[PDB]
Amino acid sequence: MSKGPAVGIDLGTTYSCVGVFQHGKVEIIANDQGNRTTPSYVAFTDTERLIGDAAKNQVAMNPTNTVFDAKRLIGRRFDDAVVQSDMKHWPFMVVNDAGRPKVQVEYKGETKSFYPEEVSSMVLTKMKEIAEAYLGKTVTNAVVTVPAYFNDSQRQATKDAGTIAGLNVLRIINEPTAAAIAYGLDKKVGAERNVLIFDLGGGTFDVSILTIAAGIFEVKSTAGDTHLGGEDFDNRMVNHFIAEFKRKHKKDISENKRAVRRLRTACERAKRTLSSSTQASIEIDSLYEGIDFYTSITRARFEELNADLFRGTLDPVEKALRDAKLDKSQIHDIVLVGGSTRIPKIQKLLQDFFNGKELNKSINPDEAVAYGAAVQAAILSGDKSENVQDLLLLDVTPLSLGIETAGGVMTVLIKRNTTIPTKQTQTFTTYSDNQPGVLIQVYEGERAMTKDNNLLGKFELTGIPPAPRGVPQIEVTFDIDANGILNVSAVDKSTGKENKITITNDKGRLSKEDIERMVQEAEKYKAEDEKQRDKVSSKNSLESYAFNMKATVE
């Protein structure tokens, strides 16, 4: 049963990467031309379909038929605005075939249209063969990564792209998570940990704040820039020089395209140099009108030229940190991913922002994602990962615990991940005037409304002395002992009367899967939720009725 291990793939916008976990080590597969990453390009000519390095190298000559940025369409509807705004930036065509987009090209003389998922399948196919060449055995099982903001639609389209290329997609995990996995930030289990994934690619920038605990991943917030990346920084260097030329020789090399191409390439190499040297040389023989161009930029002017672009970097970090509701100091880990994160200045800013905290960057930033996806791929096929046999780990709550408050809303008493033997208490009041009593109803789950969580038990507390709405004081208590049992009790603070219910939290009633499946939903609905997070107000208990009364309109 050793006919094909597991394959991890980072389906990136501009480039893609495929690695594999073999012999207790991750290995990033180089392609047929020696590259670790492969351009996500698919060119169509009158004699063949090109993919990867080969397609991209001829883009200059066959612009209208060399497609790229398919990841920006995947799962979307032709009328999506994001799509309408992007189309305006591409050489090739996008047509609307019954609601969904299709790139149209001239292939072998004929006009052809392709769904995005297919364009991607072509990328995954070259990726698949890259692996099969290295492994010498057919590749079938693969983990494909995707951005955290992607919606169900996009996830399924990314998944269809793999099955179209004969790939069985074990699972789709988020790029921020895959990154964390590559750095084994999950296997560090103990206290709850917050992780900020700082991803700066060739043209995409994404910030993610993850909370890991008990090997479970929850996406707290996402933020970034969908049109910012390395390319942009090179541009800053390219115009710099165009001007410098026009100023030295009173000649604008803009007319000539090849001149510009040559310029942009020289700058691309200089940027790389600048990440590890304080200067970079620029030598182009007969750049424009026979004129030779020989100069050199200092990291300082490079930084000066992208000054705003670089600092702007922290805004999405700040935003993300806010939407995640926590201070910079509450971040346990910072992870660097994306080629652009090699730029000294970017690192300086990120680190000076966190007061010198150490940055996780040892793993090639371009491979981190493909790397982790490869690691996650093994575990789902056969890989030693039983850390729960050394002694006694840290027992925390699997799912948030709580009670229904007027309106049918969830009010947590003990959020998930709280150490195990703890008792949390909170006070409530009646909703309407002279309320007979309150209905205590224990709920579990991570969603905002109780209808979206699981009901574990309920008990009433009658005998509340008639009082103006908001006067009675009921002290609810959630007590969880060592062995995991939950005891929910309510006390009317004006009399001493109480009532309790013991809930059997014992038995593997929740597998790793259930938790995740549920956390994923909570983040998939973080909006309807963070917005429903304003429906009513306060902590008051319903007139002794579960929100299982008559539902109304839309």
Ordered by start, the domain boundaries in the chain are 1-67+115-187+366-383, 68-114, 188-228+307-365, 229-306, 394-547
| H or E stretch covering 119 | helix 116-135
CATH of region 229-306, choose from 3.90.640.10, 3.40.50.20, 3.50.50.60, 2.40.110.10: 3.90.640.10
Distance of alpha carbon 460 from alpha carbon 546, whole angstroms: 11
- Neighbouring residues of 396: CB distance < 8 A, sequence distance ≥ 6: 192, 213, 214, 416, 417, 418, 419, 420
- Tell me, what amino acid is at 261? R
Task: List the alpha helices (DSSP H) in 152-256.
Answer: 152-163, 175-182, 230-248
Distance of alpha carbon 393 from alpha carbon 435, whole angstroms: 46
Q: Are 36 and 27 in contact (CB under 8 A)?
A: no
Q: Which technique was the structure solved with, according to the deposited record?
A: X-ray
Strand ranges (E), 347-436: 401-405, 409-414, 422-430
Fold of 394-547: Substrate Binding Domain Of DNAk; Chain A, domain 1 (2.60.34)
- Neighbouring residues of 256: CB distance < 8 A, sequence distance ≥ 6: 288
- Neighbouring residues of 371: CB distance < 8 A, sequence distance ≥ 6: 8, 19, 26, 28, 178, 182, 363, 364
Residue holding tokens 């993300």? 320
- Tell me, what amino acid is at 526? K
Sign of CA dihedral 463, 465, 470, 471: negative
Q: Which residues are catalytic?
A: 10, 71, 175, 199
- Neighbouring residues of 109: CB distance < 8 A, sequence distance ≥ 6: 46
Residue holding tokens 């995947």? 74
Between the CA of residue 513 and those of 394, 448, 508, 510, 524, what are the distances in Å? 19, 20, 12, 8, 16
Distance of alpha carbon 33 from alpha carbon 81, whole angstroms: 38
Distance of alpha carbon 223 from alpha carbon 456, whole angstroms: 35
| Helix 344-353 with 314-323: angle, nearest 10 deg | 40
Phi and psi at residue 304, to the nearest 5°: -60, -45
State the number of CA atoms in the 13 A half-sphere of 493 facing the CB: 13
Count of Cβ atoms closer than 10 Å to residue 470 Cβ: 13
The DSSP result for 336-363, as a single string, is: EESGGGG-HHHHHHHHHHTTTPPPB--S
Cα dihedral angle (209, 215, 216, 221), rounded to 10 degrees? 0
Distance of alpha carbon 408 from alpha carbon 410, whole angstroms: 7
Phi and psi at residue 459, to the nearest 5°: -150, 150
Summarize the annotated binding site for ADP as residue ranges.
14-15, 202, 268, 271, 275, 339
Q: Are 504 and 474 in contact (CB under 8 A)?
A: no
Summarize the annotated binding site as residue ranges.
12-15, 71, 202-204, 268-275, 339-342
Same fold, 1-67+115-187+366-383 and 394-547: no
Q: Work out the angle at residue 510's Cα, subtended by the Cα atoms of residues 412 and 381, and round it to the nearest 5 degrees.
A: 130
Distance of alpha carbon 229 from alpha carbon 200, whole angstroms: 6
**553 exposed, middle or buried (CB, 10 Å; 0-12, 13-18, 19+)?**
exposed
Q: At the top level of CATH, which class does the domain 188-228+307-365 belong to?
A: alpha beta
Distance of alpha carbon 186 from alpha carbon 393, whole angstroms: 14
Query: Which region holds residue 450: left if phi is over 0, alpha if psi is between -120 and 50, else beta?
Result: alpha
Resolution to 1 decimal, in Å?
2.6
The DSSP result for 245-267, as a single string, is: HHHHTS--TTS-HHHHHHHHHHH
Closest by CA to 190, choosing from 331, 414, 396, is 396
Strand ranges (E), 497-545: 498-503, 540-541
Residue holding tokens 């993850």? 210
Distance of alpha carbon 310 from alpha carbon 540, whole angstroms: 48
Phi and psi at residue 154, to the nearest 5°: -65, -35
| H or E stretch covering 205 | strand 205-213
Closest by CA to 173, choosing from 414, 395, 353, 9, is 9
Q: What is the CATH code for 68-114?
A: 3.30.30.30
Euclidean distance between the first and the last CA atom of the chain, given in angstroms as a whole number: 54
**Structure tokens given for 332:** 């346990």
**Structure tokens given for 88:** 């305006």
Chain-centre distance of CA 131, in angstroms?
25
The DSSP result for 279-292, as a single string, is: EEEEEETT-SSS--
Fold of 1-67+115-187+366-383: Nucleotidyltransferase; domain 5 (3.30.420)
Q: Are 9 and 29 in contact (CB under 8 A)?
A: no
Closest by CA to 165, choosing from 116, 220, 115, 123, is 123
Q: Are 436 and 544 in contact (CB under 8 A)?
A: yes
Sign of CA dihedral 282, 250, 230, 27: negative
Sheet holding 49-51, edge to edge: 49-51, 42-44, 66-67
**Structure tokens given for 382:** 């056969």
Bridge partners, residue 197, by sequence? 208, 335
- If you compute the radius of gyration of the chain from its CA atoms, what whole number of angstroms results? 28
Query: Which of the 8 DSSP states describes residue 433?
Result: T
| H or E stretch covering 518 | helix 512-524
